[PDB]
Amino acid sequence: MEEVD
Amino acid sequence: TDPPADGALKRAEELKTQANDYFKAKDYENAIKFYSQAIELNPSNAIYYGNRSLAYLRTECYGYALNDATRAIELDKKYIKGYYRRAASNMALGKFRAALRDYETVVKVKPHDKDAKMKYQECNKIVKQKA
């Protein structure tokens, strides 16, 4: 999704 | 100095988000940059070094990647996605056994996570590709 970190 | 204050830290948190937005923008070097800027704001965040090395990992800068990934593990001794970064660094370098050791550790923490499993088993099978 967007959870790169 | 103690941990930098709010605004500074939260801005480092910002650059974390901004660099994420650059990773989403498919620009890993700006992501690298903003993460570096975040290291200027705070220091001991495996998040910053981890995705910075992850950015280097996208740009096949595995030399820096291996450094920054390992560096993250020095900053946040337990960061699962941080090991994952270092593992990918070793994996990409051709150190499948070294990478396997890191990936193995990740999959030993969350074996329920195929996100961890995937690269573990991938490295593992490749070790078997090597006999």
Side-chain angles (χ1 to χ4, degrees), chain B residues 44-86:
Chain B
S44 329
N45 283 138
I47 296 293
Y48 303 159
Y49 276 89
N51 291 336
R52 193 192 188 226
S53 47
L54 181 269
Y56 288 114
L57 273 164
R58 306 304 302 196
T59 57
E60 65 176 284
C61 295
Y62 308 132
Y64 291 101
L66 192 280
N67 167 83
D68 285 60
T70 304
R71 201 65 66 159
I73 307 179
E74 298 296 284
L75 300 177
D76 289 291
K77 202 59 163 190
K78 291 190 60 164
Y79 179 35
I80 297 305
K81 297 170 63 176
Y83 311 144
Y84 202 88
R85 302 304 190 222
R86 186 189 184 257

Side-chain angles (χ1 to χ4, degrees), chain B residues 13-37:
Chain B
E13 281 191 274
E14 247 316 281
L15 303 174
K16 182 193 72 72
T17 303
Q18 301 195 28
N20 187 329
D21 186 67
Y22 278 95
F23 179 82
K24 293 170 58 184
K26 306 312 297 294
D27 195 288
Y28 318 112
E29 40 171 278
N30 275 265
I32 279 174
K33 172 172 64 190
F34 283 75
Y35 275 129
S36 304
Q37 303 180 333

Side-chain angles (χ1 to χ4, degrees), chain B residues 89-104:
Chain B
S89 298
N90 286 152
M91 212 293 183
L93 288 176
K95 291 164 174 52
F96 308 110
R97 185 77 69 181
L100 191 63
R101 291 179 176 191
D102 248 303
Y103 283 132
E104 200 195 80

